[PDB]
């Protein structure tokens, strides 16, 4: 319990280059004395918030930035304090992905986006744009031995299709997300998922296809294309398949819109080694030499460090990654992203398996998301009132702002609060808007 005392523990997903990370740690331990222990547990993005509520867990946790707003919101993450000189060394937009309540809550590392990966021997010239070729993606598989295999179990991999003709998580009106304008239930979304289920009903894909199956199929030459991120490339090299990495096909003339993750590194708020964790991230990991050591293990994508990214952009595969990234959307980092992912994972699994229709499946996902934002609103009103009565006004009012962010009529609620708050507390609330 309460790990540890003068060492660093890091968690990263088992699909990343954790051996390369451990190399950077050794170098850290050599220059310094401080041992670095890198682990790759399962469901780390769900294990993390549990054990960090304990006050336990790792010092540093790696995940895509979408989860981090939820951690920050629960107070599991220390604010980070790069000094301007250092902020200049990373791209502004990666710095935006790790901003929550106007505070930086992680160090951005890399930009990950899915791409179409194809076997050049089986298939020189991959199915363009889809969109006279989904008839022919459908038919390209008709020259059987399998045209396409990728992970149906995780909705990250199916979203690019669900979103192509208008599906979406939460609407932007010009910046602020309108949580409760949810788009998993709409025409665009129903059509993309329908097309997916039709691929399965016509026997071009198996609904039980997972990560390892698809990885294995492509790596043995049994299928002509997979959908995957840069981490997968090193295995494909090892497999000695002659492969390309290209743009995802379009749907109804429109590009596939992947959700783009920025692999990020948060510092546990309960960590006793926050200054050590900072020296490592800024002065070891985030260096040309640190990122190359991770990248040689499993490629990172387009790194957030400019000096190093200036070399990687000469790789066509990285050009392919960035096109797809540009055509898609950078993920929200808001706490509701969790409910979104879980709702949609259930919709995709159920429709593919046949347990519900496309429509029923997306409407139950739409409903679950709305219910999660509503639950969260009640919680935050309650929390808000309590941490006022205990005189922790700054936190007390922070929860009231959270509630207002997800409200039906936020103006009606602002009135009630000026009526129930003492004026200084009300003013202090307006600063947290
Ligand atoms: O499938 C939902 C899942 O999508 C994303 O997870 C990605 C992760 O971002 C990638 O770095 C890589 O690990 O593949 C994962 C997909 O299995 C979101 O990051 C995640 O929060 C979400 O649950």
From Swiss-Prot:
Matching Pfam families: SBP_bac_1
Any one GO biological process: maltodextrin transmembrane transport
InterPro entries linked to this entry: Maltose/Cyclodextrin-bd (IPR006060), SBP (IPR006059), SBP_1_CS (IPR006061)
SUPFAM superfamilies: Periplasmic binding protein-like II
Molecular function GO terms recorded: carbohydrate transmembrane transporter activity; maltose binding
A cellular component annotation (GO) from this entry: ATP-binding cassette (ABC) transporter complex, substrate-binding subunit-containing
Keyword set, alphabetical order: Periplasm, Signal, Sugar transport, Transport
Lineage: superkingdom: Bacteria
Localization of this protein: Periplasm
Induction: Induced by maltose and the transcriptional regulator MalT. Permanently repressed by cold shock in a PNPase-dependent fashion.
Cited function: Part of the ABC transporter complex MalEFGK involved in maltose/maltodextrin import. Binds maltose and higher maltodextrins such as maltotriose.
Family: Belongs to the bacterial solute-binding protein 1 family.
Cross-referenced PANTHER family: MALTOSE-BINDING PERIPLASMIC PROTEIN (PTHR30061), MALTOSE_MALTODEXTRIN-BINDING PERIPLASMIC PROTEIN (PTHR30061:SF50)
Subunit structure comment from the entry: The complex is composed of two ATP-binding proteins (MalK), two transmembrane proteins (MalG and MalF) and a solute-binding protein (MalE).
Protein name per UniProt: Maltose/maltodextrin-binding periplasmic protein
Organism: Escherichia coli (strain K12)
Organism classification: Bacteria, Pseudomonadati, Pseudomonadota, Gammaproteobacteria, Enterobacterales
């Amino acid at each position: 319990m309460k790990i540890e005392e003068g060492k660093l523990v890091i968690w990263i997903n088992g699909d990343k280059g954790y051996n390369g990370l451990a190399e950077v740690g050794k170098k850290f331990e050599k220059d310094t004395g401080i041992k670095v222990t890198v682990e790759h547990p399962d469901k780390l993005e769900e294990k993390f918030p549990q054990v960090a509520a304990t006050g336990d867990g790792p010092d540093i946790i790696f995940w895509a930035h979408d989860r981090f707003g939820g951690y920050a919101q629960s107070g599991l993450l220390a604010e980070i304090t790069p000094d301007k000189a250092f902020q200049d060394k990373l791209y502004p937009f990666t710095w935006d992905a790790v901003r929550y309540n106007g505070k930086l809550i992680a160090y951005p590392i890399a930009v990950e986006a899915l791409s179409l990966i194809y076997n050049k021997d089986l298939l020189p010239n991959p199915p363009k744009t889809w969109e006279e070729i989904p008839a022919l993606d459908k038919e390209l598989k008709a020259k059987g031995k399998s045209a396409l295999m990728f992970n149906l179990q995780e909705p990250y991999f199916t979203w690019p299709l669900i979103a192509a003709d208008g599906g979406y998580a939460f609407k932007y009106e010009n910046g602020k997300y309108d949580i409760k304008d949810v788009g998993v239930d709409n025409a665009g979304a129903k059509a993309g998922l329908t097309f997916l289920v039709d691929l399965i009903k016509n026997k071009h894909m198996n609904a039980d296809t997972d990560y390892s199956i698809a990885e294995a199929a492509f790596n043995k030459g049994e299928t002509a294309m997979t959908i995957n991120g840069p981490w997968a490339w090193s295995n494909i090299d090892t497999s000695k398949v002659n492969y390309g990495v290209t743009v995802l096909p379009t749907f109804k003339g429109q590009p596939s819109k992947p959700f783009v993750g920025v692999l990020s590194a948060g510092i546990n708020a309960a960590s006793p080694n926050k200054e050590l964790a900072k020296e490592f991230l800024e002065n070891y990991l985030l260096t040309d030499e640190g990122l190359e050591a991770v990248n040689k293990d499993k490629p990172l994508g387009a790194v957030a460090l400019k000096s190093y990214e200036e070399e990687l952009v000469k790789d066509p595969r990285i050009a392919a990654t960035m096109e797809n990234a540009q055509k898609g959307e950078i993920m929200p980092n808001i706490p509701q992203m969790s409910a979104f992912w879980y709702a949609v994972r259930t919709a995709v699994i159920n429709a593919a398996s046949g347990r519900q229709t496309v429509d029923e499946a997306l409407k139950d996902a739409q409903t679950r998301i709305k219910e999660a934002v509503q639950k969260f609103f009640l919680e935050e009103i309650q929390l808000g009132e309590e941490l006022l009565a205990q005189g922790d006004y700054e936190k007390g009012v922070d929860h009231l702002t959270n509630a207002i962010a997800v409200c039906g009529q936020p103006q009606q609620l602002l009135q009630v609060l000026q009526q129930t708050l003492p004026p200084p507390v009300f003013q202090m609330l307006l600063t947290k808007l």
